[PDB]
Amino acid sequence: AGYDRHITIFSPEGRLYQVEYAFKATNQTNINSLAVRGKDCTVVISQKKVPDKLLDPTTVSYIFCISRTIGMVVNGPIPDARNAALRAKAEAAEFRYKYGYDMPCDVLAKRMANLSQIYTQRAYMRPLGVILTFVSVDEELGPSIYKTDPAGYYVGYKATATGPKQQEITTNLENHFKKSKIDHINEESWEKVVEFAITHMIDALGTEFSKNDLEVGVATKDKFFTLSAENIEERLVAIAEQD
Amino acid sequence: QIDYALTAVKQGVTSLGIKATNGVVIATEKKSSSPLAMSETLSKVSLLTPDIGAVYSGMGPDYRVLVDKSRKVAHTSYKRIYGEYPPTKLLVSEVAKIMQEATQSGGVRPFGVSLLIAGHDEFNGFSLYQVDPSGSYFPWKATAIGKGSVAAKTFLEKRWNDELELEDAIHIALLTLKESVEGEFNGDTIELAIIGDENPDLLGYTGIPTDKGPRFRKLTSQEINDRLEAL
Amino acid sequence: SPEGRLYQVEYALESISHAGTAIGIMASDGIVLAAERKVTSTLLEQDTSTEKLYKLNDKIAVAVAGLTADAEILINTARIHAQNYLKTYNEDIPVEILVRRLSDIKQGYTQHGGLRPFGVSFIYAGYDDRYGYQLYTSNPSGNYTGWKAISVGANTSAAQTLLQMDYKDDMKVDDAIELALKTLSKTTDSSALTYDRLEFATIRKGANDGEVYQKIFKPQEIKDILVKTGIT
Amino acid sequence: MDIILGIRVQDSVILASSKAVTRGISVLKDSDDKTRQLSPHTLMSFAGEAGDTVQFAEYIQANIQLYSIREDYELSPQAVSSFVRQELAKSIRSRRPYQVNVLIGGYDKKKNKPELYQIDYLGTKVELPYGAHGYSGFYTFSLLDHHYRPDMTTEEGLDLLKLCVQELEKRMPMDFKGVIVKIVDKDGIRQVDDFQAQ
Amino acid sequence: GTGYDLSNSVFSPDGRNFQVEYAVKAVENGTTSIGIKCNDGVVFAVEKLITSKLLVPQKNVKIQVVDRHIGCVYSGLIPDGRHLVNRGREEAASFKKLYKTPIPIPAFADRLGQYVQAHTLYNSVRPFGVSTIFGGVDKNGAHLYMLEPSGSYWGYKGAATGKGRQSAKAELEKLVDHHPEGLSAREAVKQAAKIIYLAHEDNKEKDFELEISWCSLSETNGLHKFVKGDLLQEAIDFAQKEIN
Amino acid sequence: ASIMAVTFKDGVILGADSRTTTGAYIANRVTDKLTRVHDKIWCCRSGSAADTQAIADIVQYHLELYTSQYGTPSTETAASVFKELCYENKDNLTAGIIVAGYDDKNKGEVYTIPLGGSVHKLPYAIAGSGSTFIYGYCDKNFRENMSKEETVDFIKHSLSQAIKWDGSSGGVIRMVVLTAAGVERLIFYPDEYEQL
Amino acid sequence: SDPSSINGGIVVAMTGKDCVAIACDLRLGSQSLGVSNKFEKIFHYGHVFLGITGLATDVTTLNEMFRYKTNLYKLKEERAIEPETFTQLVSSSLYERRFGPYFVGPVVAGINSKSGKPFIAGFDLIGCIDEAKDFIVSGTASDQLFGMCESLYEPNLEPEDLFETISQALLNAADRDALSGWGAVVYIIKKDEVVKRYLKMRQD
Amino acid sequence: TTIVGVKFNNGVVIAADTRSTQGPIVADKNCAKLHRISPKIWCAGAGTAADTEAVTQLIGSNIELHSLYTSREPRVVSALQMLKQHLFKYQGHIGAYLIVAGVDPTGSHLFSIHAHGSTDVGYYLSLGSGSLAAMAVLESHWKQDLTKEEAIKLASDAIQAGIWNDLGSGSNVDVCVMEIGKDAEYLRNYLTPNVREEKQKSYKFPRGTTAVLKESIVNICD
């Protein structure tokens, strides 16, 4: 009867009800993220929220290392994020083996978006409640930022933001690439690009951060790594001593 | 249920196609889901064979995985047997068969796209085809699909004669797209491809005079702006 | 299937009396096929499709009234049965055997009721040296039937009447070419019949000997025989 | 092997077929009809491997009695031939290949002509005036070359047949214990049981 | 229309998979079970309810062992605990067979995570009726994890789940507060016995046996032995003293 | 071929010749028989070039994926992935491999995987066609806990011999030094190792 | 024993001035014994000709097969299949059974109807395409034919001339060949007319 | 068959002869042994005629489709890894011995692939029945950092060595020059040393020489 609301088929106005709902799930964690390009780096800041005093912060991560070169940050319930990360960590190991070069950021995204699409067209499987933000310093394109969503869509961003207060963060960035009229952040060392990414997020969220409320991922050529508890405090200390 | 998919096609950005005497042309707009996004990272006009391209209206993703499945079928079912690439008519047939099966198969919804496939084969000359979610397909002198569908389809009857040079049809398909345009109108929000003369410039090699290069050429951000000034 | 009724069939059997209109007339020394084309736009490319008249082998051909994408799935498999009966017995496939081969796939869904029946109704025109020239019919019911003259699709009930009227057994081939056009006088929702709303075909006693030529008409050749009366 | 002969004349086709069945050391039967009727006007004689022989001819008999019954039409010789061939050509790259050689002879009721086809276990098919499998051909083909006219009465052709069998009994080391001669014409398939003394 | 909660894969209008949330209710209505991460291992404890006098003492074991060095305890539908721990071992032995080293705790957790999470993907299989507490000692020390029916899992300093959930979680936070450096392997055992004895007042109707197991790099040389005999009374007697 | 690996105070060193022969013909005289499956876990290939290549290729993957999920791989693990391939596929392979690597705990570790598919941990191991001639030199001249340049020399001599006596061995002598401070690739040319 | 050398026979093809010729012997024999003298080795599919030598039951099977394959190309593609194309279909088609090959030695010959260009090519049993401007040979007299052609051929022969040339190459090879002969046939293929002459040769 | 590859400063060049031998006979005196995998990735085929073609047609098709999924120029090292792993799936039963070279976004590359699945990276390589003649030239005249024209002379010099001194090789010399900047150039029959001197006679037969039995006209189109 009224069961085009429960599976991935067409409503009478060409809508996929189940996908639109799937999107609504990506906020359910209540973490916000943003990503930026440098002259030759890429940066992803996500929030870390550890409410339970019984937790171990070190195990709480929405930032996944997918390959040597490629980083991914998810907005969405943890279970679904891992289902995606594990599948990417493996589509990219397979890619290297079959084809002989490291797997490139935008290709991994097209492949997860293609996947995210099948879910969108098959009755029996459900999409995932995640929005995967992929970063790297791809050997041909430079700093890359590619985002895929439960809809099956992917596209590449100068910078981007995702989650609950997504549009407050997004509109801050828009007003700083209208102003430098480019496609990136003209700073050499990634450190200053991380400071900038934290700055323009404090500005947009109207709250300060401590070394414990942030997760930072960084991509330079030949490496993608995450910043430790302390590697961030240093970044924060430097923001505070100029602002 | 096929009827509901044709409806997702009816909304979603306008796209068109015009056959001429010495070429075919297809175009759509690149609606930026944001200014932060770099619109060059997504292609609404995709190459299938060096003699055949395609554009769509509707659901982005369903087009991507249809352009992929489509390139492959060109090899698996033609090139690997007869050494040639497939003719527009038949590659189109093999795509309709692909979509017509998502229809009549259980557990899957049809695709949310109508396709415009343009191309040139040595024996059938030029031709332009439309493919619907229903798996049906029809041959067109020119048409449009999507929102601006009705406005543009009417403009094309008004402006189309069977003596158009390809440059005339480029000119038309730019006007046609100018009235419907949702966002801004330049080379960064227009995608236009043609199926014209053989481009040896673009082969990548030189030494066999029997194969002469792609008929499919995707106009650069520049080539477009240049035409829009003298417009 | 309440009273002894084939529901999902009548559904599609009457979906047929909507789309298309096709005719077959068996003369004494030839056969004739003919069809009207779906609601056409100015910009639709007339010459290409051959959308409702398909060749099956050098000696057999069908007229379609139904969903195009649906008949192509059938015809594709019938053009193959033809060739399998060649590679196998090195003789051209006999018309009834090809007809039954399809009719049996149609009725295949009319019973394994887990997939959906066929649009499409066929007129088959063929020659084989066992039963002279032949004319057949194929509703998705599964049944086939012999015909000296026949019709399927919209305005069906109407043409069957004019046909019954002007038909004579001694008929030649050119006499039957007319009877076909003439009686798409009536059964035409489009006031006035053009060469572009048409598609035509013949299987004659050859343009030369005692053999069998097949001929799907090119547009110009239609506007030429239309010239005999229709429009001028 | 095992004598398989056949000659096509003017008004019919004639098939000779050794009567003996040998199992290594002993001759087990002195009266073997080495032929299955494929239909009113189509006959198939055969020789070759032990069990493979019959099992094939019967499979063909079934499949042709089935096309006969289904279309209530008597399948033409050319066709029965080109079918039997494909069935052998299929089994030659199969797991265990039918190892059988055959002569198909029959009356094409539509051309009112007689036809003789020769097919070896490989699927090798050709149409002939006369034919044979095994070594049968060496002693007899020299005689047919010489004495054969294609206008030969059915009687004139039986005579020439006896002459071949006589040469085979003289210069051939096998005791094949006679032949059974069958004739195929407009009236169908009849058997001459007065031969080793006509 | 509605009916968004009779099928498992199905998204409620605001992003929720309801069948999972219902399973969590089955967890909440079962035996209470805990885990404590000390300075060189982990201690595990469970509440065994006593239906009638005829249940045999000490002889209905709830805590399951994985490999040789890992412990699992669960609260809820018990047979689902077993089906999960079974797939848990097939996995931990795939790993050992190929990579020789016995499976690392964090990598083990990710493997259960995916089995569970994958039971939230199709309308035709129901989520697990257990929140599972598990852990052990690997190449880099001790790890305690907890994994709910949704597939969610994180690493805890301590954890609880079951009827006495909120109650234990609160005594657990008390220790992480007093002793930041973690408890001693032996002390953590005495305390786990306290905490179970307390979270029993939320189910005080029926009677109960305690059950403790541990994995300590000093007290069981890295392996997962049970706590028995003298050391078990050591703690049963420590609970009685902090209940009175 | 003709290959070996030695452990010491600071780590592990891999050594090999560079001569792949099909028949009497040296098809390549500069072969890189030192192949890398991870930052500081490499192998020595010997046997079918097609077999050892395919295996190392497939191990490079298993370990790239193991890194993705579970982290950095023990040298021990690399060995287990090799054995599992070689043993479970013995009927169709001809490969003898030496896996060697440096972690921080154990430092120098070396595993030799003979043809069978067996696995043997050792302080040093020799293999490849021309090994037969230096079982004598090595057992007499090897010591535990050698210095970096002590070990380079031990390898240079051992392999200088193997190549003298083996026709299926030769080319240049390649080494690869695996320590905390990183990966250092060595090469010694004929004009040098022959004069020893 | 040897499959290519059981029934035997030869086939040969040449080019001339805007024309092509293909020819064969009519022999089919089990080893030493000749069985038929009316077994042609050249078949046509539209305007594209195919000669096939070697094993009879495979020569026959491949005809029966390419008829099928090309008949459907005509119906599906709306045109008759070209020589250049059909060549590529025989390659891929033969190589389909790479590890259990048809023991044949095909020669394709005909004229591309759009470009009017003459075209010949030959294959080995697994589909290597030897395209050649001059001539293609195949059979049990692989060698003899190569000998005749290498001497008797000049490019751009007028058709009535290239018949004499191709006939003499065929005839004189099969006379030095035990497993070829017993008749011969020679197709001469102009841009729109095609003449098929049978030849007189020894019969031994 | 003789084939070689030679790396130079701004690219790589690969060359081959043109003789295909069935046993002791020469079936094509001029078949190109130069195969195209991608516009600027070519390879030289030696071994079973059919297999170098088929396995090229394939990896090249897959590689074409892959350059389209990835919106990226096809890399030599891809064509290598796909060929390597295909040949090896097939326990050597596929008789391809290739020199695979080209230019991609990562520079100039030159590799050789043997049927069983082994690969070799080098600066000069040779394969096939004249492998040894060619490699003898190459080993005598190759210095590091050639130039376009030096490297071509060298490969053609090394193919000649094969032609003459090997019964397995002969006729002409094909070349393909893949410069890093430019398009690839394929010079078919870059050298034609083996031209057949004009015969001593002409054997054009006087019309009517051949005895005809029966004559007739076949019909071409229906």
Curated annotation (Swiss-Prot), chain A:
One of its GO biological process terms is: proteasome-mediated ubiquitin-dependent protein catabolic process
* InterPro entries referenced in this protein's UniProt entry, alphabetically: Ntn_hydrolases_N (IPR029055), Proteasome_alpha (IPR050115), Proteasome_alpha-type (IPR023332), Proteasome_asu_N (IPR000426), Proteasome_sua/b (IPR001353), Proteasome_subunit_alpha6 (IPR034642)
For this protein, the record's CDD domains field holds: proteasome_alpha_type_6
Q: Where is this cross-link: Glycyl lysine isopeptide (Lys-Gly) (interchain with G-Cter in ubiquitin)?
A: 223
Q: Which UniProt keywords apply?
A: Acetylation, Cytoplasm, Isopeptide bond, Nucleus, Phosphoprotein, Proteasome, Ubl conjugation
Question: Sorted alphabetically, which PROSITE patterns does this protein's record hold?
Answer: PROTEASOME_ALPHA_1, PROTEASOME_ALPHA_2
Q: Where is it located?
A: Cytoplasm; Nucleus
Q: Which GO terms describe its cellular component?
A: mitochondrion; nucleus; proteasome complex; proteasome core complex, alpha-subunit complex
Residue(s) carrying Phosphoserine: 228
Family indicated by similarity: Belongs to the peptidase T1A family.
**Function of this protein?**
The proteasome degrades poly-ubiquitinated proteins in the cytoplasm and in the nucleus. It is essential for the regulated turnover of proteins and for the removal of misfolded proteins. The proteasome is a multicatalytic proteinase complex that is characterized by its ability to cleave peptides with Arg, Phe, Tyr, Leu, and Glu adjacent to the leaving group at neutral or slightly basic pH. It has an ATP-dependent proteolytic activity.
Further comment: Present with 15200 molecules/cell in log phase SD medium.
Q: What is this protein called?
A: Proteasome subunit alpha type-1
Lineage summary = Eukaryota, Fungi, Dikarya, Ascomycota, Saccharomycotina
UniProtKB/Swiss-Prot annotation, chain B:
Mention one GO biological process in which this protein takes part, according to its record. Answer: proteasome-mediated ubiquitin-dependent protein catabolic process
* Membrane-spanning segments: none
Supply the InterPro entries for this chain: Ntn_hydrolases_N, Proteasome_alpha, Proteasome_alpha-type, Proteasome_asu_N, Proteasome_sua/b
Q: Which Gene3D superfamilies match?
A: Glutamine Phosphoribosylpyrophosphate, subunit 1, domain 1 (3.60.20.10)
Cross-linked sites for Glycyl lysine isopeptide (Lys-Gly) (interchain with G-Cter in ubiquitin): 89
Establish whether keyword NAD is in the entry: no
Q: PANTHER family from the xrefs?
A: PROTEASOME SUBUNIT ALPHA/BETA
Extra notes? Present with 7060 molecules/cell in log phase SD medium.
Give the multimer and partner information. The 26S proteasome consists of a 20S proteasome core and two 19S regulatory subunits. The 20S proteasome core is composed of 28 subunits that are arranged in four stacked rings, resulting in a barrel-shaped structure. The two end rings are each formed by seven alpha subunits, and the two central rings are each formed by seven beta subunits. The catalytic chamber with the active sites is on the inside of the barrel.
| General function of this protein | The proteasome degrades poly-ubiquitinated proteins in the cytoplasm and in the nucleus. It is essential for the regulated turnover of proteins and for the removal of misfolded proteins. The proteasome is a multicatalytic proteinase complex that is characterized by its ability to cleave peptides with Arg, Phe, Tyr, Leu, and Glu adjacent to the leaving group at neutral or slightly basic pH. It has an ATP-dependent proteolytic activity.
The name this protein goes by in its record: Proteasome subunit alpha type-2
From Swiss-Prot, chain E:
Q: Any one cellular component term from GO for this entry? A: proteasome core complex, alpha-subunit complex
**Primary location:** cytoplasm
User: Per UniProt, what is one GO molecular function of this protein?
Assistant: mRNA binding
**Keyword Protease found:** no
Per the UniProt entry, what is one GO biological process?
Answer: proteasomal ubiquitin-independent protein catabolic process
Please state where this protein is localized: Cytoplasm; Nucleus
Q: How is it modified after translation?
A: The alpha and beta forms are probably products of the same gene with different post-translational modifications.
Per the UniProt entry, the signal peptide is: none
This protein's record includes keyword Nucleotide-binding: no
Q: Which UniProt keywords apply?
A: Acetylation, Cytoplasm, Nucleus, Proteasome
In its miscellaneous comment, the UniProt entry states: Present with 12000 molecules/cell in log phase SD medium.
Q: Which family does it belong to?
A: Belongs to the peptidase T1A family.
Say what the protein does. Answer: The proteasome degrades poly-ubiquitinated proteins in the cytoplasm and in the nucleus. It is essential for the regulated turnover of proteins and for the removal of misfolded proteins. The proteasome is a multicatalytic proteinase complex that is characterized by its ability to cleave peptides with Arg, Phe, Tyr, Leu, and Glu adjacent to the leaving group at neutral or slightly basic pH. It has an ATP-dependent proteolytic activity.
Its name, as the record gives it, is Probable proteasome subunit alpha type-7
**Organism in which the protein naturally occurs:** Saccharomyces cerevisiae (strain ATCC 204508 / S288c) (Baker's yeast)
For this protein's source organism, the top of the classification is: Eukaryota, Fungi, Dikarya, Ascomycota, Saccharomycotina
Boundaries of the shown chain within the full protein: 5 to 248 of 288
From Swiss-Prot, chain F:
State the signal peptide span: none
Main location as per UniProt: cytoplasm
Q: Which residues form a coiled coil?
A: none
The processes (GO biological process) annotated in the record are: proteasomal ubiquitin-independent protein catabolic process; proteasome-mediated ubiquitin-dependent protein catabolic process
Q: Name one GO molecular function term.
A: threonine-type endopeptidase activity
Q: Which UniProt keywords apply?
A: Acetylation, Cytoplasm, Hydrolase, Nucleus, Protease, Proteasome, Threonine protease, Zymogen
EC numbers: 3.4.25.1
Q: Which CDD domains match?
A: proteasome_beta_type_6
Q: What class of enzyme is it?
A: hydrolase
Keyword Nucleus among UniProt keywords:
yes
Say which domain of life the source belongs to: Eukaryota
- Which GO CC terms are listed, alphabetically? cytosol; nucleus; proteasome complex; proteasome core complex, beta-subunit complex; proteasome storage granule
UniProt-annotated location(s): Cytoplasm; Nucleus
Q: Which Gene3D superfamilies match?
A: Glutamine Phosphoribosylpyrophosphate, subunit 1, domain 1
Catalytic activity reads: Cleavage of peptide bonds with very broad specificity
Q: Which family does it belong to?
A: Belongs to the peptidase T1B family.
Q: What else is known?
A: Present with 7250 molecules/cell in log phase SD medium.
Query: Self-association or partners: how does it assemble?
Result: The 26S proteasome consists of a 20S proteasome core and two 19S regulatory subunits. The 20S proteasome core is composed of 28 subunits that are arranged in four stacked rings, resulting in a barrel-shaped structure. The two end rings are each formed by seven alpha subunits, and the two central rings are each formed by seven beta subunits. The catalytic chamber with the active sites is on the inside of the barrel.
Protein name in the entry? Proteasome subunit beta type-1
The organism's taxonomy opens as: Eukaryota, Fungi, Dikarya, Ascomycota, Saccharomycotina
Task: Name the gene for this chain.
Answer: PRE3
